[PDB]
Amino acid sequence: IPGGWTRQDPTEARFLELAHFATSSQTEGREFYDTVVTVKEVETQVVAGMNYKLTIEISPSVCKIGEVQYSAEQCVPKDAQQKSTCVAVIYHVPWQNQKSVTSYRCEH
Ligand SMILES: [Cl-]
């Protein structure tokens, strides 16, 4: 098993699922949840578990934080033309059912 990053097909559903998980989770200093517009790039790394590195475009959603629960389906972009590019790293330990956001960094 190599230690490096392996580039994936970014259009896979599981990666969109993970992108929403990471984005829905960024709630500091906002009135609204941000949401995912697009998954541009994906890289995985085998550690004691799996690292997912997602390059995504995000946009503010219609869902107000603390007013509703986040869902991909409900929380569409206010305006999907207003995009920001971020890199999210998710650490997954499948046998403990744990996902954490290692880092979430927006170029903008
Ligand atoms: Cl690394």
UniProtKB/Swiss-Prot annotation:
Disulfide bonds: C63-C75, C86-C106
Residues of the Cystatin domain: 8-95
GO MF annotation list: cysteine-type endopeptidase inhibitor activity
Keyword field: Disulfide bond, Protease inhibitor, Secreted, Signal, Thiol protease inhibitor
Induction per the UniProt record: Down-regulated by a blood meal.
Locations listed in the record: Secreted
Tissue specificity comment: Widely expressed. Detected in salivary glands (at protein level), gut (at protein level), ovaries, and Malpighian tubules.
Annotated Gene Ontology cellular component terms: cytoplasm; extracellular space; vesicle
General function of this protein: Inhibitor of cysteine proteinases with broad specificity for mammalian cathepsins, including endopeptidases (cathepsins L and S) and exopeptidases (cathepsins B, C and H). Also inhibits endogenous cathepsin B-like and cathepsin C-like proteinases. Does not inhibit human legumain. May mimic specific host-derived cystatin(s) to interfere with its/their function in controlling cathepsin-mediated proteolysis.
UniProt record similarity statement: Belongs to the cystatin family.
Protein name, as recorded: Cystatin-2
Included range, full protein: 22 to 128 of 128
